[PDB]
Symmetry: C2
């Protein structure tokens, strides 16, 4: 009811990042700083600062989980698809997810480069540039195209996943690979090691569209934590898990 | 003297703007369309270009003076499964020499063209040669399902990361745009790569057989379109330890 309010403000914010990204892309560099393995840039740090400030201006009580039992929580990946941002300047996205007392309420994956807004509102629907998304038609794995990082599983399980499925594509940002699943464009997407902000938005998309979104053990995921994960068409979920979990695991070593 | 290059470019870009009307219906509700586009353009050559001939997936050699090559849609799998990341490819060659090329990324409303003597463009904005990418600094795109795992592993290790769009024309433009370091297709049909010749010429890229050799633009060959700075490292990995072909 006042979700309409919060949506109006988020949309105002996403619209104005338009006029802040191209200057940040043109003056772009990388930092290794404050990070074990992952790459960060000046773009995402700024979009974050910008969203923290949005939170300060409008929702002084709301808290930001970004780079337990709190009532108003936002989880943000200012730039999902960092390698893509740096190397291609395409196929990155901004992910925001809103949780009221642990229940997902609003979600956003904004594909800036292609100008596409995915949003999920509880009690309204899921939306892609204001056109309503519905439950994708049933996809069985041999009919489905799937998406995963192939450098990160033993080469043997990659080859079963190749064989069980129609084909293989990779976009390289969780949010974007996940949305393709949501649109019926892919059968499933797998991330073996997600950060919370990499997957946060997809809970609500998954719920409203009847997607299967689980850990790779098939168990339900804690949105504050994140585990190795799959978002899938309901018709190829069990087949994917089953392949991933055969012959002592999909892990790359041993 | 024959049609001007310009006047032909103007004709092609309209003919492409008339078609953002052959989708829909197609998508909505086969496919192999694509004869429907093939033929629509067969009409185009008849109405406007008496002498010109077209090579497309079906229905010979130099010295044919005015030839076009066309993949009415490159990314069939993509069109069929995703309705996205497919493109129209067109190449005009004059007594053997690539004169004009088009790769039209329909779903993202991006027409890439290459014009001999003027340059390469996306939507009319000019494309410059992309920056030097060593392979450790570059993303590579190739179908990993169609090589043996040893050579895929090394491609994985040598490079920055791996992505795949699933349409030869689109993956090749990523290389053209400096977004990818290389794209490899080990079994193209002439229409999967026709356009890229002039892009690679105008944008100082390397396009060759996997033997690092001149491709016969009339027939297939296993192929690579690549940034100048990683072209050789990529080739070496592909021809190492007995080669790239998967077996049992």
């Amino acid at each position: 009811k006042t979700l309409q309010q919060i949506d109006k403000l988020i949309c105002s914010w996403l619209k104005q990042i338009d006029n802040v990204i191209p200057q940040l892309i043109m003056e772009m560099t990388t930092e290794t700083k404050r990070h074990r393995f992952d790459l960060v840039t000046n773009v995402d740090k700024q979009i974050q600062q910008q969203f923290q400030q949005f939170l300060a201006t409008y929702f002084p009580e709301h808290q930001l989980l970004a780079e337990n039992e709190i009532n108003h929580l936002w989880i943000m990946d200012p730039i999902d698809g960092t390698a893509n941002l740096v190397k291609q300047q395409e196929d990155y996205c901004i992910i925001l997810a809103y949780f009221y007392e642990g229940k997902p309420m609003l979600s956003y994956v904004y594909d800036y480069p292609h100008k596409k807004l995915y949003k999920a509102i509880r009690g309204e629907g899921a939306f892609c540039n204001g056109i309503k998304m519905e439950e994708p038609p049933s996809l069985k794995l041999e009919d489905a195209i799937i998406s995963f990082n192939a450098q990160v599983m033993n080469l043997d399980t990659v080859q079963d996943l190749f064989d069980a499925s129609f084909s293989y594509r990779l976009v390289g940002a969780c949010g974007l690979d996940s949305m393709r699943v949501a649109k019926g464009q892919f059968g499933a997407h797998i991330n073996t090691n997600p950060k919370p902000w990499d997957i946060a938005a997809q809970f609500l998309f998954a719920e409203l569209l009847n997607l299967k979104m689980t850990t790779l053990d098939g168990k339900a995921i804690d949105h504050l934590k994140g585990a190795p994960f799959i978002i899938s068409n309901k018709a190829c979920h069990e087949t994917v898990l089953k392949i991933l979990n055969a012959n002592g695991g999909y892990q790359k070593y041993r």
